[PDB]
Write a protein that binds this ligand. Sequence first.
Ligand SMILES: *[B@@]1([O])O[C][C]([C][O])O1
Length: 261
Amino acid sequence: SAVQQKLAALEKSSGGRLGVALIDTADNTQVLYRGDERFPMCSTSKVMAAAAVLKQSETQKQLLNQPVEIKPADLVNYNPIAEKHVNGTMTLAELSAAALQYSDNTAMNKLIAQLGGPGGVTAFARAIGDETFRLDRTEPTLNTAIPGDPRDTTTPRAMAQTLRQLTLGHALGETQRAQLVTWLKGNTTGAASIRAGLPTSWTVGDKTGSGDYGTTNDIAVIWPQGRAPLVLVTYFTQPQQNAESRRDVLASAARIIAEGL
Ligand SMILES: *[B@@]1([O])O[C][C]([C][O])O1
C-alpha cells in the first residue's frame, strides 16, 4: 500500500529499523510494518506492569492505596517522582502513575517487585493472551536494547493487540480500565513522539520508551474527534550503541498513518 511504501522510505531515510502496528477499531483492520519482528520495549513495558497491578486490585480492592516505602537504595538512574519521596512512601497508585506519566524507573521496579519479579509481569501478559511479550530484567538493564537480544522484547503486532485489550477491551475491570486510560492520557513525555505527528484536536494517551542503540518507542491509543479510536505502536532502534533518540521518526510514522485514514 501507499502507507507501507512511505513507511519503508521513512525507515530508509532514518538509517534504523522501524516497527509499526496500527489497529483501526472501526473495522478492526491492521496496518503492519515489521509487525512480527522483535523490538526492545524499554519503558513501553511499564504499561504491562501497571496493568498487572491493576488486575490485582480487582480482587484486592484497596491494593492501589497500599503505601510502599522509597529507600535511597531503591533509586536507579531515572526517578523524577520517586526522588521526591525518598525516605517516605508512595501508594501503588502513585507509583503506577509515576511509571506511566513520567517514566520513573524506580516506580517501575516497585511494580515488578509487587508482582513477584519480571516473571510476574510476563505472566499477566500470557493471562490476557499475549504470548509474545517477555520481561526478563528490571530497570535500568532492561533498556540495553542489544541487537538480536530477545530479552525484554515484543512485536509491534503483539503490543498493539494487547494495548487495545487493556484500554479499549475488557482485559481489565471497568474501573481499572478507566484508570489506565486516565493515566495514559496524562502522559507527560510524549509531546515530540506520536502526538507530534497527529492533528492537535485528537486525544492521545501514550507511553514512550527509550534506551541504548537509539531505541525510541511510543505506544498510544488515539481518540479522533468523531471517529473510532485507533491503537498505534511505533518502535524504532538503530545500529550504533550510542545513537541519539529519534522521536521525529515516531512523529513522521504517525503522520504517514494519519494520512492514510
Ligand atoms: B524508559 O525507556 O523511559 C525512560 C527511562 C530511561 O531509562 O526508561
